[PDB]
Design a protein around this motif. Sequence first.
Motif, mmCIF file in Angstrom:
data_model
loop_
_atom_site.group_PDB
_atom_site.id
_atom_site.type_symbol
_atom_site.label_atom_id
_atom_site.label_comp_id
_atom_site.label_asym_id
_atom_site.label_seq_id
_atom_site.Cartn_x
_atom_site.Cartn_y
_atom_site.Cartn_z
ATOM 1 N N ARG A 41 1.416 12.122 -5.641
ATOM 2 C CA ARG A 41 1.162 10.747 -6.479
ATOM 3 C C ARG A 41 0.673 11.251 -8.007
ATOM 4 O O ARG A 41 -0.302 10.563 -8.317
ATOM 5 C CB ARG A 41 0.121 10.083 -5.662
ATOM 6 C CG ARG A 41 0.251 9.782 -4.325
ATOM 7 C CD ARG A 41 -0.294 8.702 -3.295
ATOM 8 N NE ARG A 41 0.773 7.588 -3.391
ATOM 9 C CZ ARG A 41 0.409 6.464 -2.478
ATOM 10 N NH1 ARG A 41 -0.667 6.398 -1.791
ATOM 11 N NH2 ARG A 41 1.289 5.632 -2.555
ATOM 12 N N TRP A 42 1.546 12.104 -8.629
ATOM 13 C CA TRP A 42 1.220 12.443 -10.055
ATOM 14 C C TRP A 42 1.936 11.060 -10.635
ATOM 15 O O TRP A 42 1.311 10.173 -11.271
ATOM 16 C CB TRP A 42 2.104 13.568 -10.508
ATOM 17 C CG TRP A 42 1.358 14.783 -9.983
ATOM 18 C CD1 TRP A 42 0.558 15.636 -10.884
ATOM 19 C CD2 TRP A 42 1.271 15.614 -8.755
ATOM 20 N NE1 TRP A 42 -0.069 16.715 -10.073
ATOM 21 C CE2 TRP A 42 0.522 16.630 -8.843
ATOM 22 C CE3 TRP A 42 1.986 15.229 -7.692
ATOM 23 C CZ2 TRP A 42 0.541 17.489 -7.837
ATOM 24 C CZ3 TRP A 42 1.862 15.961 -6.426
ATOM 25 C CH2 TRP A 42 1.039 16.984 -6.519
ATOM 26 N N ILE A 43 3.179 10.926 -10.488
ATOM 27 C CA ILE A 43 3.851 9.735 -10.794
ATOM 28 C C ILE A 43 4.802 9.248 -9.690
ATOM 29 O O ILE A 43 5.257 8.021 -9.557
ATOM 30 C CB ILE A 43 4.771 9.807 -12.019
ATOM 31 C CG1 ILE A 43 3.775 10.458 -13.162
ATOM 32 C CG2 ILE A 43 5.093 8.245 -12.779
ATOM 33 C CD1 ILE A 43 4.678 10.639 -14.541
ATOM 34 N N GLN A 44 5.240 9.964 -8.815
ATOM 35 C CA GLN A 44 6.063 10.044 -7.641
ATOM 36 C C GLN A 44 5.273 9.125 -6.629
ATOM 37 O O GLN A 44 4.101 9.423 -6.663
ATOM 38 C CB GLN A 44 6.527 11.112 -7.093
ATOM 39 C CG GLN A 44 5.774 12.237 -6.800
ATOM 40 C CD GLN A 44 5.722 13.198 -8.030
ATOM 41 O OE1 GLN A 44 5.302 12.801 -9.252
ATOM 42 N NE2 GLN A 44 5.484 14.317 -7.778
ATOM 43 N N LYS A 45 5.909 8.485 -5.784
ATOM 44 C CA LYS A 45 5.297 7.822 -4.614
ATOM 45 C C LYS A 45 5.293 8.741 -3.636
ATOM 46 O O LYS A 45 5.763 9.775 -3.354
ATOM 47 C CB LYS A 45 6.032 6.551 -4.269
ATOM 48 C CG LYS A 45 7.362 6.719 -4.069
ATOM 49 C CD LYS A 45 8.022 5.303 -3.892
ATOM 50 C CE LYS A 45 8.151 4.652 -5.080
ATOM 51 N NZ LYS A 45 8.898 5.391 -6.139
ATOM 52 N N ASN A 46 4.048 8.429 -2.597
ATOM 53 C CA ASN A 46 4.018 8.993 -1.237
ATOM 54 C C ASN A 46 3.688 8.246 -0.324
ATOM 55 O O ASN A 46 2.638 7.668 -0.113
ATOM 56 C CB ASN A 46 3.033 10.147 -1.388
ATOM 57 C CG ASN A 46 3.211 11.186 -0.561
ATOM 58 O OD1 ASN A 46 4.152 11.313 0.198
ATOM 59 N ND2 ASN A 46 2.569 12.378 -0.695
ATOM 60 N N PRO A 47 4.325 8.057 0.726
ATOM 61 C CA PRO A 47 4.026 7.095 2.017
ATOM 62 C C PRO A 47 3.155 7.625 3.188
ATOM 63 O O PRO A 47 2.834 8.730 2.977
ATOM 64 C CB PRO A 47 5.363 6.697 2.740
ATOM 65 C CG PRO A 47 6.534 7.971 2.178
ATOM 66 C CD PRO A 47 5.719 8.670 0.998
ATOM 67 N N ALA A 72 -4.123 12.247 -13.312
ATOM 68 C CA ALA A 72 -3.176 12.396 -12.608
ATOM 69 C C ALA A 72 -2.512 13.742 -12.289
ATOM 70 O O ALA A 72 -1.924 14.108 -11.239
ATOM 71 C CB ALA A 72 -2.220 11.289 -12.783
ATOM 72 N N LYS A 123 1.003 -1.508 -0.072
ATOM 73 C CA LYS A 123 0.036 -0.112 0.054
ATOM 74 C C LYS A 123 0.677 1.300 0.051
ATOM 75 O O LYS A 123 0.379 2.348 -0.342
ATOM 76 C CB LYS A 123 -0.971 -0.154 1.198
ATOM 77 C CG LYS A 123 -1.750 -1.179 1.146
ATOM 78 C CD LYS A 123 -2.909 -1.093 0.231
ATOM 79 C CE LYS A 123 -3.865 -0.027 0.368
ATOM 80 N NZ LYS A 123 -4.714 -0.286 1.531
ATOM 81 N N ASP A 124 2.099 1.153 0.857
ATOM 82 C CA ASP A 124 2.793 2.589 0.766
ATOM 83 C C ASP A 124 3.362 2.694 -0.539
ATOM 84 O O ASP A 124 3.362 3.929 -1.256
ATOM 85 C CB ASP A 124 3.966 2.144 1.778
ATOM 86 C CG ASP A 124 4.542 3.357 2.493
ATOM 87 O OD1 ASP A 124 3.709 4.113 2.812
ATOM 88 O OD2 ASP A 124 5.657 3.646 2.286
ATOM 89 N N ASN A 125 4.116 1.556 -1.294
ATOM 90 C CA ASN A 125 4.744 1.818 -2.669
ATOM 91 C C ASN A 125 3.803 1.601 -3.660
ATOM 92 O O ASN A 125 3.920 0.494 -4.623
ATOM 93 C CB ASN A 125 6.181 1.138 -2.706
ATOM 94 C CG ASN A 125 7.228 2.042 -2.597
ATOM 95 O OD1 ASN A 125 7.026 3.157 -1.827
ATOM 96 N ND2 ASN A 125 8.295 1.581 -3.063
ATOM 97 N N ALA A 126 2.526 2.169 -3.785
ATOM 98 C CA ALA A 126 1.582 1.728 -4.491
ATOM 99 C C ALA A 126 1.960 1.873 -6.090
ATOM 100 O O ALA A 126 1.308 1.197 -6.965
ATOM 101 C CB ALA A 126 0.047 2.333 -4.303
ATOM 102 N N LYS A 127 2.674 2.694 -6.378
ATOM 103 C CA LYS A 127 2.437 3.320 -7.782
ATOM 104 C C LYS A 127 3.061 2.378 -8.843
ATOM 105 O O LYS A 127 2.804 2.459 -9.694
ATOM 106 C CB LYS A 127 3.581 4.695 -7.827
ATOM 107 C CG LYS A 127 3.491 5.354 -9.249
ATOM 108 C CD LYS A 127 1.822 5.525 -9.768
ATOM 109 C CE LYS A 127 1.023 6.642 -8.958
ATOM 110 N NZ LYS A 127 1.656 7.907 -9.273
ATOM 111 N N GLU A 128 4.282 1.600 -8.406
ATOM 112 C CA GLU A 128 4.716 0.880 -9.362
ATOM 113 C C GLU A 128 3.963 -0.558 -9.633
ATOM 114 O O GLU A 128 4.208 -1.085 -10.796
ATOM 115 C CB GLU A 128 6.337 0.418 -8.967
ATOM 116 C CG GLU A 128 6.522 -0.478 -7.793
ATOM 117 C CD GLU A 128 6.519 0.560 -6.318
ATOM 118 O OE1 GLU A 128 6.049 1.862 -6.670
ATOM 119 O OE2 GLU A 128 6.800 0.157 -5.306
#
Lengths: 49, 53
Positions: free
Chosen positions: B47-53, A48, A33-38
């Motif tokens: 969270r456009w393309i970069q991630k966010n914790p 987006a 859930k934390d590194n959702a993007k990849e």
Amino acid sequence: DSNNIKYVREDAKKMHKLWAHIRMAMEGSRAIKDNAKEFVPHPDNTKAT
Amino acid sequence: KIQGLVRPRDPYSNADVAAKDLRQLVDNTIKVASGTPPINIPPSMLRWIQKNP
């Protein structure tokens, strides 16, 4: 494509990506859930933005 | 530390004697208080393309 042509293909630099993916899969839902993007691409990049 | 502990003396004529006394110095240790400004905990909006914790 011709494997007889020289190529160097052995080092952990090759495998860090999948090793890290395995590690966060082992970690559980927090890392995923934390590194959702990849794992989950955005439904639309235009939104987006 | 007493200043005039050792003095010249004249056994031939001591005459008068200079008075002395002892004191007590005081050291110190000051207390300071630090802190942290209130830090907002934001929702993950990078969270456009970069991630966010």
